[PDB]
Write a protein that binds this ligand. Structure first.
Ligand SMILES: *[C@H](C)[C@H]1/C(=C/c2[nH]c(/C=C3N=C(/C=C4\NC(=O)C(CC)=C4C)C(C)=C\3CCC(=O)O)c(CCC(=O)O)c2C)NC(=O)[C@@H]1C
Ligand SMILES: *[C@H](C)[C@H]1/C(=C/c2[nH]c(/C=C3N=C(/C=C4\NC(=O)C(CC)=C4C)C(C)=C\3CCC(=O)O)c(CCC(=O)O)c2C)NC(=O)[C@@H]1C
Ligand SMILES: *[C@H](C)[C@H]1/C(=C/c2[nH]c(/C=C3N=C(/C=C4\NC(=O)C(CC)=C4C)C(C)=C\3CCC(=O)O)c(CCC(=O)O)c2C)NC(=O)[C@@H]1C
Ligand SMILES: *[C@H](C)[C@H]1/C(=C/c2[nH]c(/C=C3N=C(/C=C4\NC(=O)C(CC)=C4C)C(C)=C\3CCC(=O)O)c(CCC(=O)O)c2C)NC(=O)[C@@H]1C
Ligand SMILES: *[C@H](C)[C@H]1/C(=C/c2[nH]c(/C=C3N=C(/C=C4\NC(=O)C(CC)=C4C)C(C)=C\3CCC(=O)O)c(CCC(=O)O)c2C)NC(=O)[C@@H]1C
Ligand SMILES: *[C@H](C)[C@H]1/C(=C/c2[nH]c(/C=C3N=C(/C=C4\NC(=O)C(CC)=C4C)C(C)=C\3CCC(=O)O)c(CCC(=O)O)c2C)NC(=O)[C@@H]1C
Ligand SMILES: *[C@H](C)[C@H]1/C(=C/c2[nH]c(/C=C3N=C(/C=C4\NC(=O)C(CC)=C4C)C(C)=C\3CCC(=O)O)c(CCC(=O)O)c2C)NC(=O)[C@@H]1C
Ligand SMILES: *[C@H](C)[C@H]1/C(=C/c2[nH]c(/C=C3N=C(/C=C4\NC(=O)C(CC)=C4C)C(C)=C\3CCC(=O)O)c(CCC(=O)O)c2C)NC(=O)[C@@H]1C
Lengths: 67, 160, 169, 161, 298, 160, 161, 160, 161, 160
């Protein structure tokens, strides 16, 4: 199915983590199409900045055959 | 701010604002004038409160201003009164916003390890905030002192 | 089965305490209310049959589907069972009015009532409607009669209504 | 949870009718008590920690409970006991504000006896701790609102019974 | 029975279960238990019944069966009735009274926490070919095995592993959250823990595996049950992973771990002859050498 | 009610009630007489608001009472007016409690599933409650009808 | 119930074959330990109340449980706890004489955990009381018979836990 | 008391009680319940107020309890806490009476001469009463704290 | 969980004392046995699967358990039993290294009997498999370390039976 | 202990113990004789460290034992020395176990909450444990002091 390749940077705002936090601070990952809205809203209410998003798999305007 | 908190809760439940929260916005908007009155009283009496509370802190803990302490010297006492002024400015921001969120976001997270790295006694800064509370309550209106004392002892509980 | 003095004794016994001034004040309040409780219970004994008949009549005219087909007051067997249940509610309400405690209602009325009514299909809404109808008519009759204190009469019926009732909100 | 207003509304809704005059009377009685409840809640919320401090000093300190071999000995168990007394004080404040023990039935007494029996928490010692909370709160707020708080604190004790 | 005489409204269901011929196969004494639970408040029990509580073991959704050895203990739980849960770590880190301590790691008191703390292999092209002992891959493979264990509490078999999801997480194409999502959405989980079980039983067990936490009660169970009715098991998995408590307790790099216990499960773990501390429910007398022995000592 | 909502929010935050929340509860128990006056006004005019609003709804959407409609016929019209009276009673409960929680726990959770099981047009029921709002604002004063219209508009927003 | 003899008979019977030599060694061990079991049961039946007395004195007396608010506050509940310990000691002697823990799982344990949960009985504290019973019994009777009693007392504790 | 002052003011000019004095006595009677509540919480918390205020006094002024000081020693420290308890009892008497004349008649006439004979620093006694004011004002509502702090500040003014 | 050192420390902590002579003697005994425990654990971690293979060959294979109608019939059920024996041997090695059975009671024996009775797993056959593990382990490791492993294997047998 | 840590990690990864963990465990087993020597020294001289470190603590921080302090009085001083003896016993437990796990589980989790409820200054308790560290380090050999100092400044870091 169609997948989104995203790149984001989230800050810590409530506490100072004492462990290594690069992997969850600045990261790139593949999120599915049907889960990208909720994943995006989770990041966007968390307070991060999504610096990049692209459609990694599939093509735009896919009426049928998106699965 | 309670406006920010209500918007955060509404977006967390993914809905518009409930009428009880709208009435909370009504009450906050109504009380904002009195809260702003507290704000200009505090920023009109900011110099006297900071100076006399710092003097009372110096008489309470003479080892702070003594040689060998953190606040020995004119530049060190300047940094100490700058910290007092910054904390009182945060209390003015808090009585403006009606919430402890600006204090917690600007000057109250990681202050323990910050003053640990600076070598400053966090008990001494908490005592300084307590004396600023006492001077502000003496110099300032009493129900308004009960309003500002929530932010004051929130700072006390967070630092100590 | 526990009345007000017994549940006060149990509450103090759990903490291992002697009767303090608050306990003596509660006992004094119970003992000064007791004459009005006895008068109210004698009134309950007086008009019991006529009040259960007219309360059932008011219930079945408010909700007329009970005495119709598919209702649970349809036959005379169902009608007599409903009258027996309402008389049971009035009798234990009289017991709770004498005891000044709803622990008798909990122990002997409410702890299986939802289970029996769901087992037999008996409605739980018109039941508490009839209980509250009994409460209103008894409170009005006590206001009509020479009763100085009538505030305690609503407590066992409202306890039955709340415990047997379903959590709407 | 149910307060007095929600209990009246629930009763009238299960009745299926609108609010009659008895509902008006109960609502006005709750609104009459509401200012005293709010004042008591504000005083308890201000003095939340000091009531727990005085109750622990009155009932649990310098005993076999806090001595070695006791269940309040280790400091994580001590801090847990402090947090439990904060739980009881805060939920009793909630019950006093609501005028009802429904929140105590749903959130405090729900499995608390099995929880404490699994943990090994002393039942009569925490009952005496809630009793010390009741005496300190009655001394700190007054006879009337202290009695009102003590009703729900005794409800918590009888649930622990 | 029912029609012979008037029936007392306090032993109704107990009498109904006793008058059936299956009464000598319920070995649980029903009457005394219900009479005691009448006086006492609501017990430590799932909101939908005593049978809806799995055993708090490492693997296997072991539920009580209603027919085999009947032990049903119904209790009228209403909607907003939170079950008191016992935190594995520090007691002050319980989220009931300390909701900002959801992300605090239970050091030395709770379960071991597995994270992507080390860098994934091949993250950068700074190691331009060669580099035979690129060291962090056994830690990542143990993290894969720990995620496997958390989703399915036991180690899997050869043909059952989701090697494509393993490779995507090792390369960094997905995170730990999406890896746990795909492991729970795999048809092996559907075959093992969703299909052979009652629906709310599977919801409760899946909540305990995906959050390390029994459900608080009717609100969360109603939410996941409505999602299971409308959209299905994949969407209940999606909602459980995308819940705010999941994101608070676990990051994008943290495998879930067992955070809270039922009191009955904690009693099963730490009420046996071993692993029971001496000061749990016993008067510990301060043992001392006798005073005459002390006086006779030199 | 507002007390239960504040207690639920403070319990979720694991804290006592805010001073602003306590001030809102004080304002609520002082305005209790006014809101119970709105309650007795609505119970006095229970049968007229539903009458005029049902007349406006039936002249606005005649497909409701047309043949083939969901509320076609005398008994289905009576059921529609009974649902209207149910929502008026829930608005009375909401303006008494000061919160939309007694409204939403009885008549707004699962309403879409119920009305799609019954085939009933949800937007037409929303228009019916809009007409109830306009009739209540007709036979009510200005600010109190705005107060009741807050809860009415909550019903409109959560239903439509 | 099953003793060791009925246990090995049923174990032979379920697979349907006759007694082998390895099954005969089970009877040899049981008839070796039978008179030790007889004298141990005689000693415990002689001193049945004494073991419970020293166990309650060692573990349960002067603890939280006897204090007001505890599970052994009233004299009725104290007598019930003494009755439960008499049950545990007598059924442990039954299991020790039988040489198989079938009577415990059949008449003591299969239904006791949820009964204690419904009553609010502290399972950890009664497990500690059974441990005190085991220690006093092992002091009274000996090492081998003491650990033989302790196996079935730990069986009762494991069934309770 | 206020009743005593009104009767005395009427009797000095040899008339019956004026309508102004009747209104003042009516205000005294209506505020009697709140004044009784303030006195009740003060006498309920009488031990912790004296304990915390004595601790704050001895931290802020160590010279009075250091050797060579007036209160050095456990007996003199207990006597200082006894004096603080005496003045707290007089504050409760003034709160009950509605004015300051019991405090004036019992413990504020000749207080300077008494403490001068005793050798005690009267400004440090005033600091002790100020710490009692702060601790007691932290234990009540805002209006109750202001009402009790009125009598406390009267004791401050009479001592300094 | 806890080892022998943590058991001694917990006993001294609950008893409210420092490390006396007997506690130091127990610690010295554990430090004496630690080298043998490490060597036996290394031998078991080497020959982990061989113990289970020889145990199922000695006790379980070529019987009605393996044949249809038996609990270890399918390949899924066979792999389940092999994994269960792997877990039992690994946790017995854990208990042998620690010197305490607390990990056995916390992570294995909690609910294990109820689990096996719900699944229909033969308790006697599983016990015989653990005995087969015991003799194969004692043959492969040594005498004293084999006895030390057999103590915890018999603890698993007592907890499961 | 390090044995319990290794078994916990092996149990968490569902594997037998790594041979690296095997030489760390047998290294701890062989080197435990020095640990028992340190524990024997501290147990034999346990009252000496407590007495000298208490005296040095009370000289460095006179406010905690002056009147108004948390530890003022003979019984409160005895309770403070009992707390120091408790922490020294926990240090012996950590030395015996080779790990900070018994110290953290028995007397470091919730210590801030406990001492905040008691009113005791946690920085002064940290100063007390630091004085115990200096007295013990001067009282034993250099390598033994370096071994015990890890547990000591772990306690210092957890308090501070
Ligand atoms: C200090 C030298 C200068 C500076 C600091 C500064 N840091 C941050 C926040 C972050 N820092 C990191 C870095 C790391 N995370 C890791 O895990 C590692 C390796 C172990 C490193 C090096 C990250 C990821 C952040 C983001 C927050 C987080 O902790 O995840 C900030 C920003 C804080 C904010 O968002 O307000 C700042 C400002 N800036 C200066 O001026 C100092 C000279
Ligand atoms: C008088 C000549 C006639 C009459 C009138 C009447 N009946 C009622 C009310 C009731 N009638 C019944 C009867 C039945 N129940 C059954 O199961 C059967 C079939 C065998 C019958 C016939 C019952 C139970 C009632 C009470 C419930 C109700 O209100 O319907 C009334 C009303 C009394 C009142 O309002 O108080 C009247 C006036 N009944 C006759 O049999 C005559 C034909
Ligand atoms: C009348 C208000 C409503 C009504 C009643 C109704 N009840 C039954 C049957 C039973 N009711 C009970 C309840 C009790 N048993 C007790 O011991 C007590 C307290 C002392 C109570 C309250 C029981 C056990 C039964 C079953 C057998 C019996 O009658 O004792 C029926 C009969 C249903 C049937 O088909 O058999 C009816 C009709 N029904 C209504 O609609 C009114 C709301
Ligand atoms: C203090 C008066 C006594 C006491 C207390 C004590 N409590 C615990 C730990 C827990 N207490 C609870 C209880 C609750 N959880 C809830 O959500 C609520 C309602 C809001 C309650 C009342 C729980 C669940 C625990 C477990 C830890 C956790 O929070 O998850 C302990 C610790 C037990 C331990 O072994 O560490 C103690 C000691 N003990 C006493 O002696 C005092 C008499
Ligand atoms: C004094 C009149 C006689 C007597 C007393 C004595 N009692 C004990 C010990 C206990 N007594 C009880 C009894 C009760 N607990 C309750 O809660 C109630 C009812 C409210 C009763 C009657 C209990 C439980 C104990 C055990 C102490 C505990 O709390 O755990 C002793 C001590 C015996 C011992 O060996 O410890 C004594 C001496 N003895 C006399 O000679 C007087 C005639
Ligand atoms: C023959 C193609 C190969 C082979 C066979 C071989 N098998 C065994 C032993 C066993 N095989 C099984 C397998 C199953 N049991 C089932 O119920 C099912 C599914 C229906 C399967 C696949 C089992 C359980 C055994 C154990 C013995 C028993 O059944 O009781 C052996 C013996 C191993 C030994 O050393 O004893 C052998 C030799 N070996 C080959 O080389 C051929 C490739
Ligand atoms: C092997 C000696 C005998 C046997 C084994 C057998 N086991 C299973 C399946 C399960 N075993 C468990 C047990 C545990 N859960 C735990 O948490 C622990 C300790 C960490 C243990 C030991 C469980 C839960 C299962 C269920 C499936 C799962 O693995 O999650 C089976 C399969 C039964 C089935 O229906 O699938 C078998 C056959 N049976 C024998 O006959 C051997 C003698
Ligand atoms: C001494 C360095 C400082 C100090 C001490 C002080 N402590 C208390 C009271 C208590 N402290 C504890 C703490 C513990 N219990 C444990 O089991 C452990 C770890 C093993 C610790 C650390 C407890 C339980 C108490 C209560 C005493 C009791 O048994 O009930 C006091 C007394 C406070 C009071 O008002 O009673 C004091 C004075 N004070 C200082 O100033 C030094 C910094």
């Amino acid at each position: 199915m169609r997948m989104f390749r995203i790149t984001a940077c989230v800050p810590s705002q409530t506490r100072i983590r004492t462990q290594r936090e690069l992997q969850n601070t600045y990261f790139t990952k593949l999120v599915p199409y049907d889960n990208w809205f909720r994943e995006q809203q989770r990041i966007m209410k968390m307070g991060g900045k999504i610096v990049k998003v692209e459609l990694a798999t599939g093509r735009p305007g896919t009426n049928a055959g998106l699965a | 701010s309670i406006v920010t908190k209500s918007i955060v809760n509404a977006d967390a439940e993914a809905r518009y604002l409930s009428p009880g929260e709208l009435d909370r916005i009504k009450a906050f908007v109504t009380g904002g004038a009195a809260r702003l009155r507290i704000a200009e009283t505090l920023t009109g009496s900011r110099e006297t409160i900071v100076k006399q509370a710092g003097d009372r802190l110096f008489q309470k803990r003479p080892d702070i201003v003594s040689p060998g302490g953190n606040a020995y010297g004119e530049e060190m006492t300047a940094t100490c009164l700058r910290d007092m002024d910054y904390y009182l400015r945060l209390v003015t921001y808090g009585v403006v916003s009606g919430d402890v969120t600006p204090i917690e976001e600007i000057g109250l997270v990681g202050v323990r390890e910050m003053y640990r790295s600076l070598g400053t006694p966090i008990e001494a800064v908490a005592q300084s905030v307590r004396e600023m509370k006492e001077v502000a309550s003496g110099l300032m209106s009493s129900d308004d002192a009960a309003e500002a004392s929530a932010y004051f002892d929130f700072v006390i509980g967070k630092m100590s | 089965m526990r009345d007000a003095v017994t549940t006060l004794i149990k509450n103090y016994d759990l903490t291992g305490r002697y009767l303090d001034r608050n306990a003596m004040d509660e006992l004094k309040a119970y003992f000064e209310s007791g004459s009005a409780r006895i008068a109210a219970a004698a009134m309950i004994n007086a008009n019991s049959a006529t009040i259960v008949k007219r309360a059932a009549a008011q219930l079945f005219e408010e909700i007329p589907e009970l005495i119709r087909p598919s209702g649970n007051a349809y036959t005379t067997r169902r009608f007599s069972a409903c009258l027996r249940d309402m008389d049971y509610y009035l009798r234990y309400a009289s017991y709770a009015l004498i005891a000044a405690d709803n622990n008798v209602l909990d122990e002997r009325v409410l702890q299986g009532l939802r289970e029996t009514y769901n087992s037999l299909g008996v409605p739980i809404g018109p039941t508490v409607r009839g209980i509250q109808i009994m409460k209103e008519m008894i409170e009005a009759m006590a206001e009509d009669s020479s009763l100085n204190s009538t505030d305690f009469i609503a407590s066992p019926f409202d306890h039955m209504t709340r415990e047997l009732s379903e959590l709407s909100v | 949870m149910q307060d007095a207003i929600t209990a009246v509304i629930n009763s009238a809704d299960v009745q299926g009718k609108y609010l009659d005059g008895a509902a008006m009377d109960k609502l006005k009685s709750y609104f009459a008590s509401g200012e005293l409840r709010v004042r008591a809640a504000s005083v308890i919320s201000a003095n939340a920690a000091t009531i727990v401090k005085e109750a622990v000093a009155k009932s649990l300190l310098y005993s076999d409970v806090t001595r070695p071999g006791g269940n309040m000995y280790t400091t994580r168990r001590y801090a847990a006991c402090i947090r439990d007394l904060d739980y009881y004080l805060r939920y009793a404040t909630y019950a006093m504000l609501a005028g009802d023990a429904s929140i105590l039935d749903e959130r405090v007494l729900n499995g608390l006896k099995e929880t404490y029996n699994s943990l090994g928490v002393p039942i009569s010692s925490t009952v005496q701790a809630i009793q010390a909370i009741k005496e300190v709160t009655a001394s700190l707020v007054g006879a009337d609102a202290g009695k009102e708080m003590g009703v729900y604190l005794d409800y918590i004790c009888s649930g622990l019974s | 029975g029912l029609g012979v005489e008037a029936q007392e409204c306090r032993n109704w269901g107990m009498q109904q279960d006793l008058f059936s011929y299956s009464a000598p196969f319920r070995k649980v004494p029903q009457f005394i238990t219900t009479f005691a639970q009448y006086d006492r408040p609501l017990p430590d029990q799932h909101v939908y019944g005593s049978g809806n509580d799995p055993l708090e073991i490492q693997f296997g959704a072991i539920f009580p069966k209603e027919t085999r050895n009947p032990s049903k203990r119904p209790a009228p739980f209403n909607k907003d009735t939170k079950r008191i849960l016992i935190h594995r770590g520090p007691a002050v880190n319980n989220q009931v009274g300390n909701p900002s301590a959801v992300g605090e790691f239970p050091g030395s008191l709770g379960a071991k926490v597995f994270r992507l703390n080390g860098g994934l292999p091949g993250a950068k092209v700074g190691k331009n070919t060669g580099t035979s002992v690129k060291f962090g891959e056994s830690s990542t493979q143990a993290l894969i095995r720990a995620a496997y264990r958390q989703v399915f509490g036991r180690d899997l078999y050869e043909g059952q592993r989701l090697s494509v999801a393993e490779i995507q997480l090792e390369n960094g194409d997905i995170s730990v959250r999406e890896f746990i999502k795909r492991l729970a959405k795999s048809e092996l989980f559907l075959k093992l823990y969703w299909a052979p079980h009652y629906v709310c039983k599977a919801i409760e067990y899946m909540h305990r595996r995906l959050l390390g936490r029994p459900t608080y009660g009717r609100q969360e169970m109603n939410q996941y049950f409505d999602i299971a009715s409308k959209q299905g098991f994949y969407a209940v998995v999606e909602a459980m992973i995308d819940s705010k408590e999941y994101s608070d307790a676990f990051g994008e790099d943290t495998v879930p771990y067992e955070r809270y216990l039922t009191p009955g499960g904690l009693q099963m773990r730490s009420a046996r002859v071993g692993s029971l501390r001496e000061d749990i429910g016993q008067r510990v007398d301060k043992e001392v050498t006798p005073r005459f022995v002390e006086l006779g000592q030199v």
